[PDB]
């Protein structure tokens, strides 16, 4: 089941078996990469680009058309964020709780949720520090939390 | 979480053979599981099976001939020297006339009787009878 929640749930994507591009799709690899390049300059995260390309372009999987991932394309071109997008959204959520909590100091069930969010940040930061995505002295701290976003 | 994926498959075709069923679906497949099932089939205990290719991991649909009494895993995979094989088959096997212990040796995955014939030790995977 879930890590910090006490629940379990079977809700996810389910890719098809066939790894080929469909025959209706007329976009090649280079114009799809051009679409990714022009969409990354609006500040869109890698998970938001693939939703746009799926919903309104017929790109079911960018890996099947281009032979590469979204983040690897933006990293090879140089259009990548400094810290990864799933660690970025965890710090943004920890800022917004701490912003709300300093107004409402009696809110116990945002103080508890802050500890679950912040322990998930350290668990995710250790992984990127082993895989050398973050420099090996980067430390999330509550003082420099708000400056990072 | 799921650790020791061979312990899942051997519990599934144990629990289904008790219920009298003809087929078991075990998932995910693995290449250790296929070599274990090949040892059981070549001694007559299961019968043919089909590996289903998902692009993620396999599934295997094993046919069941009702000859299996017990199929078990040994966890962890202890190192078994060739002098230590008799104690393991005293503990695990129900008779000196039938039953097998499956070892992973460096000459492949094989039963305990073949490992003596190749003069080899290894690590134990499990047992069936």
């Amino acid at each position: 089941g879930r890590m910090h929640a006490p629940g379990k749930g079977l809700s996810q994507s389910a890719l098809p078996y066939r790894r080929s591009v469909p025959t209706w799709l007329k976009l090649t690899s280079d114009d799809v990469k051009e679409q990714i390049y022009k969409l990354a300059k609006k500040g869109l995260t890698p998970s938001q680009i693939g939703v746009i390309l799926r919903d309104s372009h017929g790109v079911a999987q960018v890996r099947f058309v281009t032979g590469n991932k979204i983040l690897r394309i933006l990293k090879s071109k140089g259009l990548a964020p400094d810290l990864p997008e799933d660690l970025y959204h965890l710090i943004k959520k920890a800022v917004a709780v701490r912003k709300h909590l300093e107004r409402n100091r009696k809110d116990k069930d945002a103080k508890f949720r802050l500890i679950l969010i912040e322990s998930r940040i350290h668990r995710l930061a250790r992984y990127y520090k082993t895989k050398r995505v973050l420099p090996p002295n980067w430390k999330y701290e509550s003082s420099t939390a708000s400056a990072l976003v | 979480v799921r650790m020791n994926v061979l312990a899942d498959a051997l519990k599934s075709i144990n629990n289904a053979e008790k219920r009298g069923k003809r087929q078991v679906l075990i998932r995910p497949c693995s290449k250790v599981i296929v070599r274990f099932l090949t040892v059981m089939m070549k001694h007559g205990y299961i019968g043919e099976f089909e590996i289903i290719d998902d692009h993620r991991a396999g599934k295997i649909v094993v046919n069941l001939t009702g000859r299996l009494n017990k199929c078990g895993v040994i966890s962890p995979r202890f190192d078994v020297q060739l002098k230590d094989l008799e104690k393991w088959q005293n503990n695990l096997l129900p008779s000196r006339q039938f039953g097998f212990i499956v070892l992973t040796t460096s000459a492949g995955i094989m039963d305990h009787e073949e490992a003596r014939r190749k003069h080899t030790g290894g690590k134990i995977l499990g047992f069936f009878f």
Partner: protein, 141 residues
């Protein structure tokens, strides 16, 4: 359930040697307080001076008076009540006598009827009680 992995040998043996102290037989014979409370000090027999003859009263579901002897040991000066087994064997015992005292059978616990008596008399004045009882020897004069 218990840990089972291939590198669990320190967890397994430090748990067994800590749960071994919850056993009564291990705690008795590996702590040292029970050996310092044993008046024999771990010996099988001992020797003492008979201080007085003592009648001890039997426990409730039967009724008699068991003929014991209060004896102060030689080697450490501890005092002990000890049971004199057969009948007319308290007649063989004077006071201020050398006496040889054994255990009573249950290794420090009181054998059935006699309340709180762990010991029995074997010799008196360096003659065994069985030799006096069956008339093989007499008490020296």
């Amino acid at each position: 359930g218990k840990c089972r992995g291939l590198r669990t040998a320190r967890k397994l043996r430090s748990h067994r040697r800590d749960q071994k102290w919850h056993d009564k037989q291990y705690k008795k014979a590996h702590l040292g307080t029970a050996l310092k409370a044993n008046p024999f000090g771990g010996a099988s027999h001992a020797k003492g001076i008979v201080l007085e003859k003592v009648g001890v009263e039997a426990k409730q579901p039967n009724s008699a008076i068991r003929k014991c002897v209060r004896v102060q040991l030689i080697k450490n000066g501890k005092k002990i009540t000890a049971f004199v087994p057969n009948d007319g064997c308290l007649n063989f015992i004077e006071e201020n006598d050398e006496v040889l005292v054994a255990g009573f059978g249950r290794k420090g616990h009181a054998v059935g009827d006699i309340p709180g008596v762990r010991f029995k008399v074997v010799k008196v004045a360096n003659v065994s009680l069985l030799a006096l009882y069956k008339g093989k020897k007499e008490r020296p004069r």
